[PDB]
Copies of this chain bind each other. A is one copy, B any other.
Amino acid sequence: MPMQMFMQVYDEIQMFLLEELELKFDMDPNRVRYLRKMMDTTCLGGKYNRGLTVIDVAESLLSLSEDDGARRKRVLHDACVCGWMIEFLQAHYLVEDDIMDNSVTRRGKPCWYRHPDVTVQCAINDGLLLKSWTHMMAMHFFADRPFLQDLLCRFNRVDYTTAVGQLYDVTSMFDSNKLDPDVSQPTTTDFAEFTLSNYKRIVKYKTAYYTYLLPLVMGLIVSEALPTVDMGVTEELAMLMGEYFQVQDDVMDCFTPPERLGKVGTDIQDAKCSWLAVTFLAKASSAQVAEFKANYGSGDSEKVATVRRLYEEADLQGDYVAYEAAVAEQVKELIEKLRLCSPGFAASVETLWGKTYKRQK
């Protein structure tokens, strides 16, 4: 049912974008060919839990003041459009992050930039095009909406918020004291920034805002129910669900089959600042830490293998399971807080939690 309309609205959005480029931007059928494949490829093949959340949250707040059925159709189309704004935003960040991250695969398919006819110079701009599309579809559908001003101001703040996250992520293997663009870039070996604290900060901004906070806020917005909700609890949940999601990402990076996964994991190889990495270095012995230091951040045979055994060596899977129960409990008390006043809303956040909490296939 939801996938039904959503995908309808996709076709709607896409028709509008491609057709506008033809009339007003003097584009040839070819470049319009390119751009529709770019869009489909970069914006499709996911489980769309971010756009979808918007629709559910919207529907669940649809009765906050016998009826019509027209309001219903209006709010739920608005919710599909914001939903796709979120998915195009992500698509933008993903295309730019595979380029930044030198990844090779995404979702079973090669990254956009690693497409036979995609050059990275064009890929880079293709990412910008996706972002531009979110503003284009926003003005096209919500020009006459009283909420437009506040929709885009919040949307743009999470855009920004996500870019800051990305600067956090990408400046984490280095000594922040030595973060001066005039000198060279020697990746740390003390791993003194492989901290849980520092971990938490990159993941909150890079992940939690656009993945958990934005779908909910947009959902509220197109439902004219935003102030109906304790933003404090709401923000708490999102920040938390979002930390947990990434940690889930972190572990799946390391121990989930790349076939299963859809991309041979690199984190260890690219020496990222994952949950495993910072959780390991904190509980780890002197010997274990010398050993980690000697087989981290290198594309090897026995090495990554080394770094993978060390993590089981340290029972990171038990630390994890303890994490999840901790998180699962704070999420439960937060949701009941919301339920008091916003029952319908705490219902959709429950539904959100349920697509997070498991997170398996």
Contact = CB atoms under 8 A, between A and B. Distances in A.
A248 interface: no
B132 A159 contact: yes
A62 interface: no
Interface stretch (A172-180, A221-229, A310-318, A329-337): A172-180
Interface in A9-25: 21, 25
Given A124-B124, A161-B25, A180 B34 contact: yes
A125 interface: yes
A292 interface: no
A166 interface: yes
Contacts of A121: 99-102, 170
A353 interface: no
B128 A96 contact: yes
Taken together, the copies of this chain in the complex come to: 2
Contacts of A181: 34, 37-38, 41, 112, 115-118
Interface stretch (A48-56, A76-84, A145-153, A276-284): A145-153
A99 B124 contact: yes
Contacts of A35: 167
A205 B27 CA distance: 11
A222 B66 CA distance: 43
A129 interface: yes
Contacts of A141: none
A168 B28 CA distance: 10
Contacts of A44: none
A325 interface: no
A207 B253 CA distance: 42
A163 B117 contact: no
A360 interface: no
A180 to B, nearest CB: 5
A350 to B, nearest CB: 29
Contacts of A135: 156, 159-160
A341 interface: no
A171 interface: yes
Interface of A: 21, 25-28, 30-31, 33-35, 37-38, 41, 96, 99-102, 112, 115-122, 124-126, 128-129, 131-133, 135-136, 139, 148-149, 152-153, 156-157, 159-161, 163-164, 166-168, 170-171, 176-185, 201, 205
8 contacts: A26-B205, A33-B179, A37-B182, A96-B125, A112-B181, A122-B170, A139-B153, A139-B156
